């Protein structure tokens, strides 16, 4: 029972923490792309404003 | 038949003793199999932690 508990919790935590790490990387990437796209829109619409 | 009921009687008792010893030997083999499997599961605990 102890061995099954540790194996099952390791198997679940691996597939859960890989997803969590990938989601963290995607969140940081998404906010950085949000900054870059914000600059892109704020300059495109500013020039098109003129 | 008076000695036949003696050779049969002594071999039946020998057969009964052999079954007693065989079951005792199998009884202790069941002890050792389960204990060895318990030690194997003990080691498998850290094996599965590492895995």
Curated annotation (Swiss-Prot), chain A:
Q: Where in the cell is it found?
A: Cytoplasm; Nucleus
What's noted about post-translational modification?
Phosphorylated on Tyr residues after EGF stimulation. Dephosphorylated by PTPN11.
The source's superkingdom equals Eukaryota
What this protein is reported to do is described as: Required for normal vault structure. Vaults are multi-subunit structures that may act as scaffolds for proteins involved in signal transduction. Vaults may also play a role in nucleo-cytoplasmic transport. Down-regulates IFNG-mediated STAT1 signaling and subsequent activation of JAK. Down-regulates SRC activity and signaling through MAP kinases.
Q: What is known of its domains?
A: MVP 3 mediates interaction with PTEN. MVP 4 mediates interaction with PARP4.
Q: Note the subunit structure.
A: The vault ribonucleoprotein particle is a huge (400 A x 670 A) cage structure of 12.9 MDa. It consists of a dimer of half-vaults, with each half-vault comprising 39 identical major vault protein (MVP) chains, PARP4 and one or more vault RNAs (vRNAs). Interacts with TEP1. Interacts with PTEN and activated MAPK1. The phosphorylated protein interacts with the SH2 domains of PTPN11 and SRC. Interacts with APEX1. May interact with ZNF540.
Task: Spell out the protein name for this chain.
Answer: Major vault protein
């Amino acid at each position: 029972a102890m061995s099954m508990a540790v194996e099952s919790t390791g198997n679940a935590k691996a597939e859960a923490e890989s997803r969590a790490e990938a989601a963290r990387i995607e969140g940081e990437g998404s906010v950085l792309q949000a900054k870059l796209k914000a600059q892109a829109l704020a300059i495109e619409t500013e020039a098109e404003l003129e | 038949l008076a000695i036949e009921i003696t050779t049969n009687s002594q071999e039946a008792a020998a057969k009964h003793e052999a079954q007693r010893l065989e079951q005792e030997a199998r009884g202790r083999l069941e002890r050792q199999k389960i204990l060895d499997q318990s030690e194997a599961e003990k080691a498998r605990k850290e094996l599965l932690e590492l895995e």
